[PDB]
Structures are given as structure tokens and as C-alpha cells.
Design an enzyme around this catalytic site. Sequence first.
Site, PDB file in Angstrom:
ATOM      1  N   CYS A  84       0.827  -1.101  -0.039  1.00  0.00           N
ATOM      2  CA  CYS A  84      -0.024  -0.042  -0.040  1.00  0.00           C
ATOM      3  C   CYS A  84       0.994   1.217  -0.174  1.00  0.00           C
ATOM      4  N   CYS A 122      -1.153   1.725  -3.574  1.00  0.00           N
ATOM      5  CA  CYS A 122      -2.177   2.658  -3.115  1.00  0.00           C
ATOM      6  C   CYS A 122      -1.744   4.055  -3.209  1.00  0.00           C
ATOM      7  N   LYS A 131       0.472   5.380  -6.323  1.00  0.00           N
ATOM      8  CA  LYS A 131      -0.436   5.364  -7.355  1.00  0.00           C
ATOM      9  C   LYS A 131      -1.371   6.588  -7.416  1.00  0.00           C
ATOM     10  N   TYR A 180      -7.430  -4.055 -13.127  1.00  0.00           N
ATOM     11  CA  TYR A 180      -6.916  -2.558 -12.454  1.00  0.00           C
ATOM     12  C   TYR A 180      -6.010  -1.957 -12.603  1.00  0.00           C
ATOM     13  N   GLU A 217      -5.495   1.639 -14.655  1.00  0.00           N
ATOM     14  CA  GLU A 217      -4.885   2.786 -14.014  1.00  0.00           C
ATOM     15  C   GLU A 217      -3.631   3.386 -14.602  1.00  0.00           C
ATOM     16  N   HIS A 245     -28.301  19.498  -4.700  1.00  0.00           N
ATOM     17  CA  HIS A 245     -28.199  20.168  -6.034  1.00  0.00           C
ATOM     18  C   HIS A 245     -27.389  21.381  -5.950  1.00  0.00           C
ATOM     19  N   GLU A 253     -26.854  13.469  -6.669  1.00  0.00           N
ATOM     20  CA  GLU A 253     -28.267  13.599  -6.702  1.00  0.00           C
ATOM     21  C   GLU A 253     -28.857  12.634  -7.641  1.00  0.00           C
TER      22      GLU A 253
HETATM   23  C1  FAD Z   1      -0.269  -0.816  -8.100  1.00  0.00           C
HETATM   24  C2  FAD Z   1      -1.107  -1.015  -7.072  1.00  0.00           C
HETATM   25  C3  FAD Z   1      -2.168  -0.326  -6.619  1.00  0.00           C
HETATM   26  C4  FAD Z   1      -3.029  -0.601  -5.805  1.00  0.00           C
HETATM   27  N1  FAD Z   1      -3.988   0.541  -5.576  1.00  0.00           N
HETATM   28  C5  FAD Z   1      -5.029   0.084  -4.443  1.00  0.00           C
HETATM   29  C6  FAD Z   1      -5.905   1.089  -4.176  1.00  0.00           C
HETATM   30  O1  FAD Z   1      -5.886   2.173  -4.747  1.00  0.00           O
HETATM   31  N2  FAD Z   1      -6.810   0.570  -3.194  1.00  0.00           N
HETATM   32  C7  FAD Z   1      -6.711  -0.635  -2.471  1.00  0.00           C
HETATM   33  O2  FAD Z   1      -7.667  -0.775  -1.674  1.00  0.00           O
HETATM   34  N3  FAD Z   1      -5.621  -1.483  -2.904  1.00  0.00           N
HETATM   35  C8  FAD Z   1      -4.895  -1.172  -3.884  1.00  0.00           C
HETATM   36  N4  FAD Z   1      -3.972  -2.010  -4.165  1.00  0.00           N
HETATM   37  C9  FAD Z   1      -3.954  -3.376  -3.606  1.00  0.00           C
HETATM   38  C10 FAD Z   1      -3.245  -3.162  -1.936  1.00  0.00           C
HETATM   39  O3  FAD Z   1      -2.125  -2.523  -2.086  1.00  0.00           O
HETATM   40  C11 FAD Z   1      -3.238  -4.511  -1.283  1.00  0.00           C
HETATM   41  O4  FAD Z   1      -4.491  -5.365  -1.508  1.00  0.00           O
HETATM   42  C12 FAD Z   1      -2.720  -4.563   0.051  1.00  0.00           C
HETATM   43  O5  FAD Z   1      -1.314  -3.811   0.172  1.00  0.00           O
HETATM   44  C13 FAD Z   1      -2.515  -6.070   0.334  1.00  0.00           C
HETATM   45  O6  FAD Z   1      -1.854  -5.810   1.954  1.00  0.00           O
HETATM   46  P1  FAD Z   1      -1.150  -7.108   2.874  1.00  0.00           P
HETATM   47  O7  FAD Z   1      -1.131  -6.727   4.157  1.00  0.00           O
HETATM   48  O8  FAD Z   1      -1.822  -8.502   2.089  1.00  0.00           O
HETATM   49  O9  FAD Z   1       0.078  -7.170   1.982  1.00  0.00           O
HETATM   50  P2  FAD Z   1       1.415  -6.329   1.939  1.00  0.00           P
HETATM   51  O10 FAD Z   1       0.814  -5.039   2.036  1.00  0.00           O
HETATM   52  O11 FAD Z   1       1.987  -6.738   0.419  1.00  0.00           O
HETATM   53  O12 FAD Z   1       2.472  -6.686   2.836  1.00  0.00           O
HETATM   54  C14 FAD Z   1       3.321  -8.090   2.808  1.00  0.00           C
HETATM   55  C15 FAD Z   1       4.298  -7.606   3.583  1.00  0.00           C
HETATM   56  O13 FAD Z   1       4.979  -8.715   3.964  1.00  0.00           O
HETATM   57  C16 FAD Z   1       6.380  -8.632   3.775  1.00  0.00           C
HETATM   58  N5  FAD Z   1       6.814  -9.850   3.833  1.00  0.00           N
HETATM   59  C17 FAD Z   1       6.652 -10.929   2.706  1.00  0.00           C
HETATM   60  N6  FAD Z   1       7.125 -12.295   3.244  1.00  0.00           N
HETATM   61  C18 FAD Z   1       7.797 -12.150   4.216  1.00  0.00           C
HETATM   62  C19 FAD Z   1       8.509 -13.020   4.956  1.00  0.00           C
HETATM   63  N7  FAD Z   1       8.746 -14.072   4.837  1.00  0.00           N
HETATM   64  N8  FAD Z   1       9.074 -12.410   6.050  1.00  0.00           N
HETATM   65  C20 FAD Z   1       8.967 -11.097   6.534  1.00  0.00           C
HETATM   66  N9  FAD Z   1       8.149 -10.028   5.820  1.00  0.00           N
HETATM   67  C21 FAD Z   1       7.818 -10.717   4.810  1.00  0.00           C
HETATM   68  C22 FAD Z   1       6.390  -7.753   2.631  1.00  0.00           C
HETATM   69  O14 FAD Z   1       7.946  -7.150   2.527  1.00  0.00           O
HETATM   70  C23 FAD Z   1       5.554  -6.781   2.641  1.00  0.00           C
HETATM   71  O15 FAD Z   1       5.856  -5.435   3.353  1.00  0.00           O
HETATM   72  C24 FAD Z   1      -3.027  -1.746  -5.107  1.00  0.00           C
HETATM   73  C25 FAD Z   1      -1.927  -2.640  -5.458  1.00  0.00           C
HETATM   74  C26 FAD Z   1      -0.898  -2.231  -6.277  1.00  0.00           C
HETATM   75  C27 FAD Z   1      -0.002  -3.460  -6.486  1.00  0.00           C
HETATM   76  C1  FAD Z   2     -27.636  32.629  -5.706  1.00  0.00           C
HETATM   77  C2  FAD Z   2     -28.506  31.541  -5.247  1.00  0.00           C
HETATM   78  C3  FAD Z   2     -27.827  30.286  -5.162  1.00  0.00           C
HETATM   79  C4  FAD Z   2     -28.624  29.004  -4.762  1.00  0.00           C
HETATM   80  N1  FAD Z   2     -27.897  27.939  -4.832  1.00  0.00           N
HETATM   81  C5  FAD Z   2     -28.603  26.926  -4.595  1.00  0.00           C
HETATM   82  C6  FAD Z   2     -27.845  25.712  -4.499  1.00  0.00           C
HETATM   83  O1  FAD Z   2     -26.807  25.476  -4.911  1.00  0.00           O
HETATM   84  N2  FAD Z   2     -28.747  24.518  -4.329  1.00  0.00           N
HETATM   85  C7  FAD Z   2     -30.252  24.603  -3.745  1.00  0.00           C
HETATM   86  O2  FAD Z   2     -30.643  23.669  -3.426  1.00  0.00           O
HETATM   87  N3  FAD Z   2     -30.679  25.702  -3.804  1.00  0.00           N
HETATM   88  C8  FAD Z   2     -29.930  26.776  -4.191  1.00  0.00           C
HETATM   89  N4  FAD Z   2     -30.479  27.981  -4.063  1.00  0.00           N
HETATM   90  C9  FAD Z   2     -31.899  28.082  -3.452  1.00  0.00           C
HETATM   91  C10 FAD Z   2     -32.883  27.634  -4.411  1.00  0.00           C
HETATM   92  O3  FAD Z   2     -32.619  28.282  -5.822  1.00  0.00           O
HETATM   93  C11 FAD Z   2     -34.318  28.023  -4.295  1.00  0.00           C
HETATM   94  O4  FAD Z   2     -34.737  27.296  -2.909  1.00  0.00           O
HETATM   95  C12 FAD Z   2     -35.242  27.392  -5.301  1.00  0.00           C
HETATM   96  O5  FAD Z   2     -34.996  27.961  -6.518  1.00  0.00           O
HETATM   97  C13 FAD Z   2     -36.744  27.984  -4.588  1.00  0.00           C
HETATM   98  O6  FAD Z   2     -37.879  27.306  -5.543  1.00  0.00           O
HETATM   99  P1  FAD Z   2     -39.318  27.932  -5.758  1.00  0.00           P
HETATM  100  O7  FAD Z   2     -39.812  26.819  -6.734  1.00  0.00           O
HETATM  101  O8  FAD Z   2     -39.769  28.066  -4.391  1.00  0.00           O
HETATM  102  O9  FAD Z   2     -39.224  29.214  -6.586  1.00  0.00           O
HETATM  103  P2  FAD Z   2     -38.468  30.144  -7.650  1.00  0.00           P
HETATM  104  O10 FAD Z   2     -37.530  28.949  -8.271  1.00  0.00           O
HETATM  105  O11 FAD Z   2     -38.185  31.193  -7.372  1.00  0.00           O
HETATM  106  O12 FAD Z   2     -39.772  30.040  -8.506  1.00  0.00           O
HETATM  107  C14 FAD Z   2     -40.932  31.123  -8.262  1.00  0.00           C
HETATM  108  C15 FAD Z   2     -41.211  31.496  -9.787  1.00  0.00           C
HETATM  109  O13 FAD Z   2     -42.412  32.180  -9.536  1.00  0.00           O
HETATM  110  C16 FAD Z   2     -42.491  33.273 -10.572  1.00  0.00           C
HETATM  111  N5  FAD Z   2     -43.626  33.945 -10.062  1.00  0.00           N
HETATM  112  C17 FAD Z   2     -43.556  34.751  -8.838  1.00  0.00           C
HETATM  113  N6  FAD Z   2     -44.567  35.380  -8.682  1.00  0.00           N
HETATM  114  C18 FAD Z   2     -45.458  35.115  -9.771  1.00  0.00           C
HETATM  115  C19 FAD Z   2     -46.738  35.619 -10.246  1.00  0.00           C
HETATM  116  N7  FAD Z   2     -47.571  36.226  -9.523  1.00  0.00           N
HETATM  117  N8  FAD Z   2     -47.306  34.934 -11.383  1.00  0.00           N
HETATM  118  C20 FAD Z   2     -46.411  34.364 -12.061  1.00  0.00           C
HETATM  119  N9  FAD Z   2     -45.428  33.912 -12.030  1.00  0.00           N
HETATM  120  C21 FAD Z   2     -44.827  34.214 -10.628  1.00  0.00           C
HETATM  121  C22 FAD Z   2     -41.208  33.675 -10.759  1.00  0.00           C
HETATM  122  O14 FAD Z   2     -40.991  34.458 -11.894  1.00  0.00           O
HETATM  123  C23 FAD Z   2     -40.635  32.278 -10.460  1.00  0.00           C
HETATM  124  O15 FAD Z   2     -40.095  31.981 -11.845  1.00  0.00           O
HETATM  125  C24 FAD Z   2     -29.790  29.263  -4.230  1.00  0.00           C
HETATM  126  C25 FAD Z   2     -30.431  30.490  -4.362  1.00  0.00           C
HETATM  127  C26 FAD Z   2     -29.991  31.592  -4.783  1.00  0.00           C
HETATM  128  C27 FAD Z   2     -30.534  32.859  -4.818  1.00  0.00           C
END
Ligand code: FAD
Ligand code: FAD
Lengths: 461, 461
Positions: free
Chosen positions: B41, B46, B49, B180, B184, B450, B455
Amino acid sequence: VASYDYLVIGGGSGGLASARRAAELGARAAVVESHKLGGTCVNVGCVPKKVMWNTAVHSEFMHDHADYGFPSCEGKFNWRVIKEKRDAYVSRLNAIYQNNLTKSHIEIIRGHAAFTSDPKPTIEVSGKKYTAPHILIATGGMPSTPHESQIPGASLGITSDGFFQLEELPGRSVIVGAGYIAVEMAGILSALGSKTSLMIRHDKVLRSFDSMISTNCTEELENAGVEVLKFSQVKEVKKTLSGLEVSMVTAVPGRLPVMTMIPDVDCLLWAIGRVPNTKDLSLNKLGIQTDDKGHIIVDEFQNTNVKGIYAVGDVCGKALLTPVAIAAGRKLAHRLFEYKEDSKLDYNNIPTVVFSHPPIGTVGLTEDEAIHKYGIENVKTYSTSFTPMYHAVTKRKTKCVMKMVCANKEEKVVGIHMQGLGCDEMLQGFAVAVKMGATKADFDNTVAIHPTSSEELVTLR
Amino acid sequence: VASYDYLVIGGGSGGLASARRAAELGARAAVVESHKLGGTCVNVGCVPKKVMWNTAVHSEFMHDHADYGFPSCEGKFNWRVIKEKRDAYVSRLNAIYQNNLTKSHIEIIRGHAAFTSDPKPTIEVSGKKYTAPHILIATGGMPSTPHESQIPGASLGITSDGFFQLEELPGRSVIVGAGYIAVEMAGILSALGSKTSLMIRHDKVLRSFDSMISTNCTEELENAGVEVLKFSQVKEVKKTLSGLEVSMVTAVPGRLPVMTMIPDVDCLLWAIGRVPNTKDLSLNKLGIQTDDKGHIIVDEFQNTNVKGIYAVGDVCGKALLTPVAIAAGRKLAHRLFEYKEDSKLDYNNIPTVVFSHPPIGTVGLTEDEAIHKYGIENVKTYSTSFTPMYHAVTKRKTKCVMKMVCANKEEKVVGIHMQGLGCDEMLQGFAVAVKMGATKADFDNTVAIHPTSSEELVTLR
Ligand SMILES: Cc1cc2nc3c(=O)[nH]c(=O)nc-3n(C[C@H](O)[C@H](O)[C@H](O)COP(=O)(O)OP(=O)(O)OC[C@H]3O[C@@H](n4cnc5c(N)ncnc54)[C@H](O)[C@@H]3O)c2cc1C
Ligand SMILES: Cc1cc2nc3c(=O)[nH]c(=O)nc-3n(C[C@H](O)[C@H](O)[C@H](O)COP(=O)(O)OP(=O)(O)OC[C@H]3O[C@@H](n4cnc5c(N)ncnc54)[C@H](O)[C@@H]3O)c2cc1C
Ligand SMILES: NC(=O)C1=CN([C@@H]2O[C@H](COP(=O)(O)OP(=O)(O)OC[C@H]3O[C@@H](n4cnc5c(N)ncnc54)[C@H](OP(=O)(O)O)[C@@H]3O)[C@@H](O)[C@H]2O)C=CC1
Ligand SMILES: NC(=O)C1=CN([C@@H]2O[C@H](COP(=O)(O)OP(=O)(O)OC[C@H]3O[C@@H](n4cnc5c(N)ncnc54)[C@H](OP(=O)(O)O)[C@@H]3O)[C@@H](O)[C@H]2O)C=CC1
């Protein structure tokens, strides 16, 4: 008076989603829309924002180019190029959504709807009347701005709507607010080269998120070059010879207040919340209940106080997210047209991602919320903080923080909070597990995926 | 003869993980290691990588730079820079692992272990004898290479071990195998500029993955500039004036076989599997059972046929992944030192990611496997194919494919398969949900995030 089975006011996420599901169930539906279909999500929200985020993400990665064995990338981002491609993409989506409606046989009534004085709930759009036994209000909201009476010159600042109209990258920008949009926009403007200040009323952003997140997020912003002005607020704005000049008051607790001028500001962005769009609906003609902010009041089934009138999405002022409006609109169509009386959206455990740098993902209860709900003795958290292997070879660094909030002896998972690279795509599946009531043993019993950041969540100790 | 509670042969993932948990439980343990701690690892798997993958990821992103409004990045990747930083990072890890052992009070016996003729199972390392009532064999494996008798000149090619020794990017490279490592390494060499050919015995790579994945993955490689030589195999290799010359036979079914020479090859990489490292253990002195490939045979509890001797990890030849070796080694420590007789690793639903471009994530049964297990009438799949919003503005494109395999009326989720940007960090949480026995309703009842790729999995129809 043209009659339908379902009349939907607003063609945004919630309105479209509801209309489309109702039509699948056989309802003869019409959608009234006064602007562009797709509403906020498509036009001025989710979509155009994400495109800009991907762009800022490119900026950061490009800082790491040389560390990774490549030759240094030299320079100037060109706002207009991406702006044009972003607008086009939005045009594509509008055309798609319109097509989705037509294929479903949903009628699109173009114009601004308002309720009438008529006894049976009836709307008027451009002189014509329309009615239905089921009317859905899904008119969304708008950006909130300060009154000139409280902050003179407030109107010289823009909102997220105006951000999407900018044609050039502002040289100097000041963002007011400490919530989602403030954090997102500050992160985008900054990565793209604008000299950015974030002005917040307290000491941390995202103060309603788990405290681990608000702390880490505030630091990440500072580390990314965003100047966070704590305990500060705008007193007045004025148009000088070359840009705006912002007067602010800084009142650190335990200190005397101090007034500062911020000169040569190109962009002043108000990111202080949203207001419901109910003002011009004539709700009062039917006596539909609203709170004092103008939100429509609904029950657990999205019913208003008036029979046959429902409301979903941002206009109700709760969980203002696209996927929430959609899910609530869909459950509502099943209840109405498929007679599933128990059909409703559970507002617990809704996951959310903040497109910061790095992004934030959160689902369920914060540590304090779980403490309040179950009692300190019954709450156990697990957390980790590490530097992603991506930065093993870079001079620039970001952190990854994860916290798991568990409850009771079983250690039921009641909240997950994280910030870090990859956290935008990592959350969804854990949110499924949390929704199903996973316990920490369920997490712990899932074999990890190596080498990833996600594996940390299943090996917390 | 020094006695311990637990003797672990091999200091790789499985061996270290087991020793450390045993020591926490009070066992007096020693780890025998003949090379470097961290085993495959850390040293040649891991870790190194993933660093190279992140590097290739940089190469791709840099192709999109201009589309995103930036100025074109000009050029030449420098292999030696990243190679040096990669090696250093690996040095850091070795020092960390060694420290982890010392802090746990685990003894490290340096050298090569082999069983003795002694009655009670006893090993010898450098003349000294060691014994324990519980001995774990976790010696891993090695890359498999062709015999010169079957493929003359096979020894002119390198393995994944040799890949990690390269000091310069090979000009022309040919990779043999379709699993894998082949996928990768081909993806890394290609993104970094090597003119790469992947030589596979059939028509698709990853033929044991769901067929959607093997198809999509083969196409993605071609689209990324990798030349896939189907139905081909190496007949002989020879050292010409400037590089290697590979003789291959191509036998497309329904065609006459054709012999081709591939000239001027800089790197020939054998990625044809791994062999267990049991050869020099003297297993036969204890009569420990192995299969005909040299793998050690174990039961569901990791027991060999001999009492007090266990084996885990790659040496057992099943689920050759780091996190599997670790989980099996840990469950084994709990069984031995905490008397949890039911303590064992479930080999079902182990998730795995292939670090291709884009990456692959998979967990559970492929469509064919579920069809064989439940019957065609009882298997339902859902799938989607789309272009990630990241490419809404790029000329270069990649796809995202997702497939969900459900069983029975309840539509229990028995397999998830996907390829696409972000799929490396997306899998973990869905794997938790699959392990818990989620049904499609559980997915469907989780509110989406959102705007993300993730979502899609919760909105399949
Ligand atoms: C390139 C690569 C990328 C990977 N990426 C991921 C990832 O992103 N996510 C993930 O979850 N897994 C990943 N894996 C897999 C993960 O690394 C292995 O599943 C994990 O390390 C296995 O752990 P282990 O404890 O079984 O063995 P190891 O970590 O290999 O430990 C065995 C140890 O025993 C020692 N040893 C061996 N024989 C003896 C002995 N006789 N006496 C004393 N010491 C000894 C070795 O030196 C070593 O240090 C990846 C593997 C590779 C090869
Ligand atoms: C800058 C900003 C960023 C935001 N970012 C997020 C975010 O990332 N995630 C999130 O979940 N929420 C976010 N929000 C909040 C989210 O936008 C609001 O909660 C959501 O739009 C409210 O929906 P509504 O249907 O109540 O009203 P609105 O979407 O305001 O709809 C009301 C509508 O009624 C129309 N209307 C009003 N009165 C009348 C009338 N008398 N006759 C006819 N039409 C009318 C208006 O023109 C409008 O189109 C953000 C809000 C702002 C201001
Ligand atoms: N990624 C996503 O999912 C996104 C979702 N959205 C949705 O849209 C909603 C609207 O976003 P946004 O407009 O950021 O609203 P929020 O309500 O998220 O953030 C506003 C914060 O600014 C501070 N504030 C309030 N009034 C003032 C004032 N007068 N002066 C200075 N600061 C003030 C407060 O924090 P404090 O008390 O600390 O000062 C307040 O909570 C979001 O909450 C979210 O539901 C929006 C963007 C992205
Ligand atoms: N990301 C991760 O998790 C990683 C994990 N690993 C682990 O390490 C293991 C070893 O990887 P790898 O060495 O790729 O082994 P694999 O067994 O994965 O792949 C080898 C494939 O090459 C083909 N092949 C076999 N013999 C020959 C031959 N003589 N000539 C040509 N092609 C041949 C076969 O496919 P076909 O029948 O189609 O020809 C065979 O299945 C992996 O299976 C995995 O468990 C390794 C790398 C990364």
C-alpha cells in the site's frame, strides 16, 4: 373562466415539479409564469452559481500546477468568456424546461397571476380568469435589500440577481452578510482575482451550522485571501468619483466602536436573506394567512388556511433549497391526484452543501441541537481533522474536518458535518444512511474505500 | 526461543492493522518484516499510485483551462519533480508507521521469516527462533510476470513495481492486461503525455465488472487517447537499437490471426495479476494448505488448516484490497484477544474504486450476478447516462453512467455501479446504505443535493 384540475402559480422548481407529477397522474394542469421558466434555480441561482464555482475551482487548481510538475500558468482570467457561456447554458435549460412542460401536456399561462375577489378561489392573469379545485402557490422569493431610510445609499449595492448581470470582474468587492450566498460569492470573487472583503455582524460565518463548521469555514476564507471584517455593519454608502465608498461601524465587544471608510469599491453585494414573493398576489382577498415577513403559512401537508389552496418552496420560508421545493411539490401531487393522504415531505434530515472552498456538506442535527434534544449525557461525537493527500505535494493547503454526532447508547447517527475537497459529492449517500437510521456500528461495519477522504467517516474512533 | 502472544509475518496493511489491534487488547505482539513497513500500500501501491493519479487529473483539468476563461497553459510535464516529491511522501509514511508500532509497544523483527521443522509452530528469522500460540501470515503478493519459456524476452518488460522506479516519462508505452492496474496505469501514462497502447485479450477491459462499466470504461479510455489493441497478445519481445520491439498476434474472432510488430517501445508494462508470496515460507514443514497458485487456504475466520496459524490479506487471494486486509486483520484480533468468537469479516458488499479517468465506483452484485442469484424475473435495474454539468462549457467531454441493481418486490438495492467525475468520493456513503439493506424506497425518500452528480442516484426512475 377556464377550469383546470390543477393551477400552479410560479414556474420554478417547486411549481414545475408539482405540475409535472400531477399531469402524470392524469391531472389537467396549467402553470402560470410571469418571467422565465426554471425560476430562481435555473436563471439566477443553483445553475449559474455552480458554473461560477467550477470556474473558481479551476483558479485554485491552477495555483497547484507548478507543484505538480507542470509549468507555471501565467494569468488573467477573462470574465466575459465564461459569462457568455454561462448565459448560453442557462438559455439551453430554459428551452429544455419549456419542452418538458409541453411533452407533459401542461399549459403555460404567461403573465402575472393575482387572486380575485371571487368566492371560489379564482386567479386573474392579463384580464382572463382561471380556476381549479386545487391551486398551488409556488412564487418563490427575492433578495432582501436595506431601505434607504436605514442605510442611505443602500440602493448603490447589488444582490445575487445583480451578480449574474455583471460583465466584468469587479476590482474591489465588499460582501455584506454571513450566510450561504455571502460565503459562496466571496469565495468565487476572491478565487477569480477580486480584492474581496466579507462584512459580518459577528465573528464567524454560518453561525447556524455546527460550530466546527462555522469556525473552520471562517478560517478557510481567511486562508484563501478573503478579508473578514468582524463585528461590522454598513452605516452608509456613497458614489464617489471612482467607485463607492462604504462607511462602516466596527463594534467588537469589549471595545469602543470605530467608524471606517472603505474607498474605491467596485461592487457592494447585499447577501442578507430573501423575502417571499407574495406582495402582489392579492392574498388578502381570500384571507390567506401569511407571517409578518409575508411568508405563506402551511401545515405539514402544504395546506394553507383556505381549502384547495396550497403553497410549497421558498414562499413558505422553510428549508429554502431547490430539492426541497421539488420533493414537497411531488409529494403534494401524489396526495392530491393519487389520493395518498399520508403523502408529505419529512423536513428532518435534509442534506445541504455549501459551495465554499473547500465545500461544506451537512445533514441532521448540530452538536448543540442534539444536546438540546437528547441531553448532554446522551450525546457523543466523533471528529477528525486532516490534510487531504491531494496536498501532500503542494505548498498551498486546505484542511478536511468531519464530525459525527451520535445519540443514545446505540449511537444512532443524528448528524454529519464536514468541510473538505470532495465533500460536495460525498454527502448524498451518507444522507441516505442517516435517513434510514444508521448507527455508528453500521458505518463502522462498512469496509472503507482507499485511498479517499470519504473513508474517514467509516473509520472514526 | 522467544515467546509472544501474537507473531505477525509481514508488516503490510493486514499485518500492521492486526498487530496494532491485538496490542490494544493487551497482547504482547511482534511484527516480522523483511523490507519496508507499510508493505505494498505505502511503497508500491495505493499511495504512490494515488499521487500519480492526482497528477494526471491535473493534466486533464489543464486541457479545460482555456474553456473556463483562462489563458492556455503551454506544456511539458516534468516527471522528475513529482517523482521526487512522491518518494519523499512515501518516506514520511514509512517513518509514521514505524512510530505507530513503537507507540503500541509492538516489537519489529527485521528480516525474512520461515517456518521451522519444530513441532509447535515456530519461525526462524536470521538464525533466531520465535514462537506464539497465535501466528498470523500476512506476507502479501507480487506482480506476476511471463516466463521466458512462454514469451521470450518477457523479462525486458516491467511490472507495477518497476513503474514506481521510473525516473522519466516513457515516450512510447505498451501495457499488457485488462484489469485494475492496466486501466490505472494506462490512464496515468496517457494523461501525462506517453503514447500509450493497452493490449487486452478480448474486446473490453474490466470484464468482471458490470457490463455497463466494462463497456463505458473501454470507450472512455479510447476517447482519452489510449489505443486499445483488442484480441491481442504478446508473442515475443526483443531489445532493438532504440527501445523494445513487441511482436503481437491479433486474433479477432471470425478473422484470420495477424502478426504485428510494435517498434520503438520505451516501456513494456506487464499488468497481468499477482502471485502470493508463500514460496519461501517453508509452509510444507507444517503442512499448511495452499491452492495451486500458492495461496494460503483459510476458513471464514481466517483459520488455516493448522491450529494457531491464520492468514489475511492478499496472500489468501480473495478481495485483494488494502481496506479488506485491514478489516480482516482487525476482526481477527478481536476474535483472538477479545474472545469474540463470531468476529469475522463479511466478504459481501465490499466497495471498490478504480482510479481511471473518470474514476469507477462499484459495490455489490453486477446485473448478471443478481440475475443468477435471484432469477431474471426478480431483478430490476435502473440506470442513467449524462454529461456532468462541469462539461457544460468545455469542448472536451466525459460521461457519467450509473446503474442500480434491485432484487425482489421490495427492490432491495443489491448493486451500485458508476463511472464519472466525483465517483471516487461518492461511493462510500452509498456503500453504507447498501450494507444496511436499503431498498430503492430508502434512496428515493432521501432529499437530493443540488446541483451535484450524486443526486442522480436518489432520483432514478
Ligand atoms: C499498483 C497497486 C495499486 C493498488 N491500488 C490500490 C488502491 O488504490 N486501493 C486498494 O484498496 N488497494 C490497492 N491495491 C492493492 C493493495 O495494495 C493490497 O491489497 C494490499 O497492500 C495487500 O496488503 P497485505 O497486508 O496483504 O500485504 P502487503 O501490503 O504486500 O504486505 C506483505 C508484507 O510482507 C512482507 N513479507 C513478505 N514475506 C515476508 C517474510 N517471509 N518475512 C518477512 N516479511 C515478509 C513484505 O515485504 C510486505 O511488506 C493496489 C495494489 C497495487 C500493486
Ligand atoms: C444565488 C443562489 C444560489 C442558490 N444555490 C442553491 C444551490 O446550490 N442548491 C440549492 O438547493 N438551492 C440553492 N438556492 C436556493 C434555490 O434556488 C431555491 O430554494 C429554489 O429556486 C426555490 O424554488 P421555488 O420553486 O420556491 O421558487 P422559484 O424557483 O423562485 O420560482 C418562483 C417562480 O414564480 C414566478 N412568479 C412569482 N410570482 C408570480 C406571479 N404572481 N405570477 C406568475 N409567476 C410568478 C417567478 O418568476 C419564478 O419563476 C440558491 C438560491 C440563490 C438565490
Ligand atoms: N448551496 C446552496 O444550497 C445555497 C442555498 N441558498 C438558499 O437561499 C437562502 C438565501 O441565502 P442568503 O441570502 O445567504 O440568506 P441566509 O439567511 O443564508 O444568510 C444571511 C445571514 O446574514 C446575516 N444578516 C442578516 N441580516 C443582516 C443585515 N441587515 N446586515 C448584515 N448581515 C445580516 C445573518 O447572519 P448573522 O446573524 O451571523 O449576522 C443572516 O443569517 C439560503 O439560506 C439557502 O436556504 C442560497 C445559496 C446557496
Ligand atoms: N484501485 C484499486 O483498488 C486497485 C486495486 N488493485 C488490487 O490488486 C489486484 C492486482 O491487480 P492486476 O495485476 O490488475 O490484476 P487483475 O487480476 O485485476 O487484472 C488482470 C487481467 O489481465 C488479463 N490477463 C490475465 N492473464 C493475462 C496474460 N497472460 N496476458 C494478457 N492479459 C492477461 C485478464 O483479463 P481478461 O480475461 O479480459 O483478458 C485478467 O483478469 C487487483 O485485482 C485489485 O484487487 C490493484 C490496483 C488498483
